[PDB]
């Protein structure tokens, strides 16, 4: 977020971008085609689907191909766990129950 980039020096931004490029290269090479994003599955899995509540007015969110849902505040959805996981970490959604 731009609010947080305000504190970094120019050379620090250079370092951060180099690190992202290299790390993304490693993950893409792990195996199969286009590898494995190891920055996910941070907790051991209990179920396929979870119920999530939106904390902020946010734009359109794409679920599969042309299908999308609108993240208006206090709307509530039932979705597969692996699509929601990063938005929960950043603070957009809440895992209820």
């Amino acid at each position: 977020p731009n609010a947080l980039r305000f504190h970094m020096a120019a050379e620090e931004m250079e370092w951060f971008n180099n690190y992202k490029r290299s790390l993304a290269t490693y993950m893409r090479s792990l195996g199969g085609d286009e590898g494995l994003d190891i920055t996910q599955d941070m907790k051991p899995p209990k179920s396929l689907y979870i119920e999530v509540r939106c904390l902020k007015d946010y734009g359109e969110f794409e679920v599969d191909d042309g299908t999308s849902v609108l993240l208006k505040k206090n709307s509530q959805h039932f979705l597969p766990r692996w699509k929601c996981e990063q938005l929960i970490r950043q603070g957009v959604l809440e895992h209820i129950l």
């Binding site: 020096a9 050379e11 620090e12 250079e14 370092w15 180099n18 690190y19 290299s22 790390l23 290269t25 490693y26 090479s29 792990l30 195996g31 199969g32 085609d33 494995l36 190891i38 996910q40 599955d41 051991p44 899995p45 396929l48 692996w82």
Partner: protein, 203 residues
């Protein structure tokens, strides 16, 4: 060989990597085989209809496997980033026939990290220093893995005449034997060949 045993070997490597205070030796065979298993099973579920019960059971199995693989790889990457000059120099020194601690992709990542970090420090502060102080040695500045750490373990094969050294006065040295299926608390430095050989498990 059979898939059940392959999964068991992955889950063994996971726990050894958690508690050992160094970067243990690499396992390229396991990673390649587990990855192709996931690719194959994905295509098999893709070809069938998605409404059925057994399909959901298969998907749950895949999530449990993928979590262990991801967790294991994240931990190895922490240890590479933390001790970069030491793992690089050790691999540069390695004699023929002994296994490497790094897979080729891990080594590539390590080399990139080393170059990037040195460049940042040189550009931000060291070029402005007096001419006699513009060089620094990261091999000296970065700490080393602490092999005297204490660990819990469980033994899978019997072992005999293991020497324990309290303090470091020879008058207190003594030996013990590790019976099948027992559990012990001891310094990592004494048992390090047993972990590499597969005689014991860290718990």
């Amino acid at each position: 060989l059979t898939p059940a045993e392959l999964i068991e070997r992955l889950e063994q490597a996971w726990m050894n990597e958690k508690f050992a205070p160094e970067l243990l030796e690499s396992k390229p065979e396991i990673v390649e085989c587990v990855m192709e298993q996931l690719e194959h099973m994905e295509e098999n579920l893709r070809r069938a209809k998605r409404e059925d019960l057994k399909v959901s059971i298969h998907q749950m199995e895949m999530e449990r496997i993928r979590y262990v693989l991801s967790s294991y790889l994240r931990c190895r990457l922490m240890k590479i980033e933390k001790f970069f000059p030491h793992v690089l120099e050790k691999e540069k020194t390695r004699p023929e026939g002994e296994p490497s601690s790094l897979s080729p992709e891990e080594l590539a990542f390590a080399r990139e990290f080393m170059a990037n970090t040195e460049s940042y420090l040189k550009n931000v502060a060291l070029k402005h220093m007096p001419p006699n102080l513009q060089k620094v040695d990261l091999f000296r500045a970065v700490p080393k893995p602490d092999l005297d750490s204490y660990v819990f373990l469980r033994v899978r094969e019997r072992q005999e005449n293991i020497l324990v050294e309290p303090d470091t006065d020879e008058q207190r040295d003594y030996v013990i034997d590790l019976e099948k299926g027992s559990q012990h608390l001891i310094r990592y430095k004494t048992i390090a060949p047993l972990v590499a050989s597969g005689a014991v498990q860290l718990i």
